[PDB]
Amino acid sequence: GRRPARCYRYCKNKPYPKSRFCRGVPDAKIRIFDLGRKKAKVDEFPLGGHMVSDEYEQLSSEALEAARICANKYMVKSCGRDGFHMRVRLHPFHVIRINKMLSCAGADRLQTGMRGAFGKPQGTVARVHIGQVIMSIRTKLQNEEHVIEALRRAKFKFPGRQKIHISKKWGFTKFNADEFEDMVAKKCLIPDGCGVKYVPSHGPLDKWRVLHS
């Protein structure tokens, strides 16, 4: 087994990725990050709801996958299997260490105390700030009372205190919802898959002619 999350909850040990100086870490458990119907373009999922934290702590890869699955399962039996699109916006890059395990008896091997106690790695956690999302679900506008409910259930898999918040942005974009449908009309925004291209009016004019034809 492993230690409980009471031992590696607080950010105190200087961000420590796997690199040329840290080798042989165990693989993180959360492998799938985007989930649902990943090919929905723009107008299919207009709503956007987030899951922001209110603590400066570090969430673990064991907790990120476990909360991803419970937030998945409620959205499956609410609006079909492809009526949603969640995307966990965290990545466990900070690496957790553990000191060695003394077994028997003080002679073998090399150490019998805190001597030589820079520990070996055993885990990966992701540090969060105060203003920072954790999960984000995009659905139709008639599924607002289910994105709140699916993310309320995923709050019970994290140590800290989180808040549920529908955004003003259209989907997973950075543009407001009220302005979006008219910015698509005036060709400032061009859809391509899950995101949208912003087309500013200071490029070459041959880019303008192909777009505005």
Partner: protein, 159 residues
């Protein structure tokens, strides 16, 4: 304990600035240094010969000795209890004139200029600089239009 190497911790101070690498600009080689003037020791990493030590980067001294390529500078070095005056040999790529003395040597000539012409005009002009006395009284015109009422705004959660 860390090693007592000559260039430990000089990863960024002795590195060239961004898009300012390569060849050293050649007017730095023809700045003239007469003995007794105030120079600032920086020290670039392109020229490896004659570079100062990392306790002299950013410090300031005066010239006592001029040679063919380098220069001799008296720099105050604050070791633990006492400030002693070291004498270091530094090539001229690693130094540059200090504008702190230049802004003073041109006002000595300018205070002495106003003072020798203060007699035929009969004025007692001010020579000392005074450290920003408080503002005198003045009238603030409203110009017709009322001062706009500011107000604290409600709290939104957006980020």
């Amino acid at each position: 304990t860390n090693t007592k190497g000559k260039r430990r911790g000089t990863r960024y101070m002795f590195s060239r600035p961004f898009r300012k690498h390569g060849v050293v600009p050649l007017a730095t080689y023809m700045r003239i240094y007469k003995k007794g003037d105030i120079v600032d020791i920086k020290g670039m990493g392109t020229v490896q010969k004659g570079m100062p030590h990392k306790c002299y980067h950013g410090k300031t001294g005066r010239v006592y000795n001029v040679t063919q390529h380098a220069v001799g500078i008296v720099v105050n070095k604050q070791v633990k209890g006492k400030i002693l005056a070291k004498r270091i040999n530094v090539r001229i790529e690693h130094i540059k004139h200090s504008k702190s003395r230049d802004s003073f040597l041109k006002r000595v000539k300018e205070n002495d200029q106003k003072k020798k012409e203060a007699k035929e005009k009969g004025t007692w002009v001010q020579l000392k600089r005074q450290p920003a006395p408080p503002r005198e009284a003045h009238f603030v015109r409203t110009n017709g239009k009322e001062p706009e009422l500011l107000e604290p705004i409600p709290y939104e959660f957006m980020a």
